[PDB]
Design a protein around this ligand. Structure first.
Ligand code: K
Ligand code: K
Ligand code: K
Ligand code: MG
Ligand code: MG
Length: 136
RNA sequence: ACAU
DNA sequence: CGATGT
């Protein structure tokens, strides 16, 4: 502890897992929604959590912001650190879009730099992350 | 077991 | 109850 209020918080939302995936990023302090991705017909929770972090990195870099990013996903934080999303989702025609976006996010990480700290949101101590979809 |  | 991940 405690919370770094000057930060961006991201989270996935889904209808099924695998299922329809979306994500958004919010100002941790105010809850203002700063970006939201159009729903992707089939993906996993972790692919969406990964895309949300990478989108946050790109969003902050474009704006010359040094704010950290909070995610509640141990998995996605590791995938970003590794620059590799180790998803089990079948690659087929139905999953082509999510896998294209994941491939492109990895490619961005491999061609750009950033100093953005990627921090674990401590849900057990602080409650749900401010970007949560409220579906659980 | 832990994190979603 | 089901699923995705380390
Ligand atoms: K939720
Ligand atoms: K959670
Ligand atoms: K499990
Ligand atoms: Mg989450
Ligand atoms: Mg959530």
């Amino acid at each position: 502890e405690e919370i770094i209020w000057e930060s961006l918080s991201v989270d996935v939302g889904s209808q099924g897992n695998p299922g329809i995936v979306e994500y958004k990023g919010v100002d941790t302090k105010t809850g203002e929604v700063l970006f939201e991705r159009e729903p992707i017909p089939i993906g996993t929770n972790n692919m969406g959590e990964f895309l949300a972090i990478v989108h946050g990195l790109r969003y902050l870099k474009e704006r010359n912001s040094r704010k950290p990013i909070y995610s509640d996903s141990q998995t996605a934080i590791k995938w970003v650190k590794d620059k590799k999303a180790k998803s089990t989702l079948v690659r087929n025609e139905e999953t082509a879009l999510i896998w294209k976006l994941v491939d492109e996010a990895e490619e961005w990480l491999n061609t750009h730099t950033y100093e953005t700290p990627i921090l674990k949101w401590q849900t057990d101590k602080w409650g749900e992350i401010k970007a949560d979809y409220g579906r659980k």
